[PDB]
Each structure stands twice: as C-alpha cells, then as structure tokens.
C-alpha cells in the first residue's frame, strides 16, 4: 500500500513515505501531525514494535492528527493490513469461549444491544482482520484483531474489558 | 413418567394409562378427548409410528383436547421425553448450516426478530430435546427436535419452512 507521514499539520515539515511493515519509525521522524494514505489499510502504534495505542487508517488525506482520533502526535511503528477474503468472527458471552455466542460476518456499531445477550468477553477470529473499538459507533481505543484466539481481553491488548463496536478492516473508497 | 388417556372429555369414557414409548395406541383407544399427565413431558402423534402431527404435553389436567392445541381427537402414538441436562442449540441463517448463526441456551418466543439476522433455515441440536413451533409465542404446528442435525426443514418433519418459536422441553411444575 502507500502511506506518507508529515511532522507538521497541513501536510508540511519533514516527511517519510512507508510501503510496508515497520517495527520502528523514530529514526525517520519524531512527530506526526498529518498523513496522506494513497492506498491500503494501516494500523499505527504510539510505540515501536507495534505496542501501545493503535489506529486504523485508510485512503484519505489527514491535515490534522485528530482526523484519525489520535490521543497525541506519536506514531513509532506501522503495519499494512493484508487484503482479506471474507470476514467471520464469533463473539462469546463469557471468557474462554463460554456462554451463548453468535457468529457475525459484518460490521456492528453497537455490540451490547444487538444480540440476544448483552455481555461480551471473548472472540475467535475465524477469518479476516477486524478492528475492535471500546465505544459504540467506532469511537474510543482501537484494537486490531488478526485471525486467532482472544480468550481474555488482555489478548487483544486492552487494559480493561470495555468494547463497543467491531468493524471489518476493508477499504471503503 | 405417567400419562392417562380418556376417550371422552371431562376425564370420562374408556381410559388407557401409558408409562413409556408406544408405537401404536389404536388397539387400546380410538379417540382422545381428555388426558391427565401425572409426570414427565410427552410428545403425542396423530398417527402410529410417531408420524403426522406432534403435541408436547406436561403435568396438568386436560378436560378438553383444545387444552394442548389439538387439531382433532386422534392420538395413535406417544414418546416419553427423557430428562435433559443442559440445552444447547445453534440456529443457522441458511440451509446446510450456512450464513450467520447463533447459539442459544434458553427459550425464544420470537425467532425472526430476536437475533442479528431474521432468516432461519437449519438447526444443530447440540444438547437436549427441544420443541419447535411454526408460530410465535408457542403456537401452530409443533415439531420435536432431538439431539442431531436438521439441515433442511423436512428433517424436522415439516412440509413448509415456517418457524416462530423454540422452547426447551423441560418440566414446569
């Protein structure tokens, strides 16, 4: 895919164009106050090695870092999310895959009041990359889910259990 | 369990008490216009060999055959439903287990407007005996589901795909 980083808002200052995964970006730029994404869906992290706060971005021009809900201006690592073919995920009521469960194939902007059960504690990502938000309507802390098991909340990198919405990481352009 | 059949309403006429499965009842009584169930959950059929219309009955006294939603007064076979330990069933959106799906553990009086999807075409009974109705709030044609696969509607004995509610076959007394 193609992404460009700008140290200063309005697409100015020092810039660094990246075309794939990058475990560390601090040697290239020290602050990101603007970004242009020409293609692909990316996940950005506040720290190196893909740690700390995550942010999903797609095609579009961002003159200001609030355009992607940035907590601040640090972006020290990035991941290019591959092209998925079909999305399939199961949402469980209790931890370790217990209680009732549902299998969704599309976006849910409200998790606690959409299904036959309100509590949500584990996920098994059967197919495709998904983005998890702590709030409804895709707000709050974001967490990338790649195909695999997410038995307990820590597995998805959160420090708490708040989830509010789930959306398939797909391009919308 | 214990069930008694009465040819005439109000608990009168010729009576036949049954304590288990019975492939044929026509040699004992020719019409059932009343029934007393002292214990256990039973499924009754209009014809011998457990075929035709089915009816779920439990503890209670029935002076008239409308008390169990009888289409008429024929009862030619019966089955005693065993004691289940936990109920677990999956409901699929499309036939042969396709589309989204949900796993329920309790009674649903409204199937088409309870989950994230409205269409319902197959069931996999993971545990326990369940009763399926064609209408909402446990009305219409009844179909017994024992643990197993129900990929297409014919598998549950219906001549059409109308389903409206599902309830666990358990004693409520």
Curated annotation (Swiss-Prot), chains A, B:
Q: Which residues form the signal peptide?
A: none
Q: Where is the Beta/gamma crystallin 'Greek key' domain?
A: 1-39, 40-82, 87-127, 128-170
Q: Does the keyword Magnesium apply?
A: no
Q: Which GO terms describe its molecular function?
A: structural constituent of eye lens
Q: Which UniProt keywords apply?
A: Eye lens protein, Repeat
* Chain spans, region Connecting peptide: 83-86
InterPro entries named in the record: Beta/Gamma-Crystallin, Beta/gamma_crystallin, G_crystallin-like
Supply one GO BP term: lens development in camera-type eye
Taxonomically, the superkingdom here is: Eukaryota
Q: What does the domain comment read?
A: Has a two-domain beta-structure, folded into four very similar Greek key motifs.
Q: What does this protein do?
A: Crystallins are the dominant structural components of the vertebrate eye lens.
Q: Belongs to which family?
A: Belongs to the beta/gamma-crystallin family.
Q: What is this protein called?
A: Gamma-crystallin F
């Amino acid at each position: 895919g193609k992404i460009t980083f700008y140290e200063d808002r309005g697409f100015q200052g020092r810039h660094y164009e990246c075309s794939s995964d990058h475990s560390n970006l601090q040697p290239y730029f020290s602050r990101c106050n603007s970004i242009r994404v020409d293609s692909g869906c990316w996940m950005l992290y506040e720290q190196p090695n893909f740690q700390g706060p995550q942010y999903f971005l797609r095609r579009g021009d961002y003159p200001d870092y609030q355009q992607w809900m940035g907590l601040n201006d640090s972006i020290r690592s990035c991941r290019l999310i591959p092209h998925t073919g079909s999305h399939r995920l199961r949402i469980y009521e209790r931890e370790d895959y217990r209680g009732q469960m549902v299998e969704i194939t599309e976006d849910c902007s409200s998790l606690h009041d959409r299904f036959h059960f309100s509590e949500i504690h584990s996920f098994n990502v059967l197919e495709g990359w998904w983005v998890l938000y702590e709030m409804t309507n895709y707000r709050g802390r974001q967490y990338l889910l790649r195909p695999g098991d997410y038995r307990r909340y820590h597995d998805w990198g959160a420090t708490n259990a708040r989830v509010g919405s789930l959306r398939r990481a797909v391009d919308f352009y």
